[PDB]
Amino acid sequence: NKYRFIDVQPLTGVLGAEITGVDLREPLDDSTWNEILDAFHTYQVIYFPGQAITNEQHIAFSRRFGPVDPVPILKSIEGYPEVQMIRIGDDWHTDSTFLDAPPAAVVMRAIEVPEYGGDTGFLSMYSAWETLSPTMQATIEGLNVVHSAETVHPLVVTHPVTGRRALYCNQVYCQKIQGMTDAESKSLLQFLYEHATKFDFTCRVRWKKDQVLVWDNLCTMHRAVPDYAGKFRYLTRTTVAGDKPSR
Template identity: 30%
Template sequence: MPIGFGAFVEEINLRQIGESDTGKLREALLEYGLLVVRDQGLAPDEQVAASRIFGSLETFPNTGNQVAGVPQIFRVASRPADGHVEVGRYWHSDGSFREVATPITLWQTVEEAREGGQTLFTDLQLAYRELSLEMKRKVEKLITVHRNGILHPLVMLHPKTGRPGLYLNMGLTHHIQGLREGESEELMAELDQHFSRPGATYIHAWQKGDFVIADNLRVAHKATSVSADQRRILNRTTVSGNDVFWNKVDGREKLVA
């Protein structure tokens, strides 16, 4: 990944992960923002277990095309019978519509496409650093408003590292507070292009057995299309913002004054 973020993790078996490896994975995620672990092929219950090393998991309703008995899995697919389709084809961080934003997303390949279906990732902290000084001044105190009314700072400080990064869901953000409608749309379009600037994205082509971990407050992602004549399935788990690993000390909840 010669783009300044992200790392491949080698020689690890997520079915048999000890305390030392857990600590290393957590540290690596904070350092790189995106981790790719090859050749895992985790079953749904194994994925849930591996995901829990980063915190408690969010749950989702079973709409009939999900994994029965495993509400922690949100399945996305190329065909409606296999999972949710047409999901996230714009720059976003999962769970930004929540008051306490979803901090971590994890995916496991179930069926890979022959062609297409890649996922793009971009570094939100680098995106902020590479803004002009004038643009930094423009965005630093702005607030985004989601369609459901949830507010988030456009420049978000990472709760663990304290580093600033842009935080903007291109599909679910209704407007930016304090800007006229045209100004809000213009700024969002400009930042959308900035996320996709040359050399800023890592394009992940899903392979059999891939397990990918993303810090949603450090990186955004964007799905690409895959034809319905191909069977492509990803199982996705997400960590709750109220119970992510960096809010714990020695396995216990932090005390918040």
């Protein structure tokens, strides 16, 4: 690939990629960082295996992407209220979309994982949008969705940095399409979900100790796999803030 400061091993031909040849415990210069971010924007989700960093180093790193909020809930490691831990989102979703302004991204970090199982699967909502017929794109271009646990977001959002359109709806937080009856709203959204969760649009992340991963919370969805029952899974994550999604 066209990348001189980082090695870059794409996971599928649709999203996801792996990054090596960089010590995350050290500071990185503009041209190394310009590459890391240029990658994250093209692949949508990126991971860095065998990065034995510290929580302070975890924060700084996240901050490079954008301001570092705590999510209220979750339990932050006491000492680091920006760094929160993980040990129901086995339905595909993206995170905290009931917020006027949900997270741009999240950076996740493997502490103690199982040998196998406890994968995380992601999918591309650029792709989901992108595979709708021009006629269907037009038909729902201007619709809005009500997300809750309360707010409204557009059904198709433009990425603030990259300007690609991405379909934006998820079954965990989306009540209905504003202005439609429920029979109507249900009808569409179900189609749109059965369409986005196709296997062609997905990828699967294998979890290995001190791997550090970043996903774009606007233009992907993701889901936990429950195939580890019995085995300890302990990861941490910081949350980076984004503007209000828009069309």
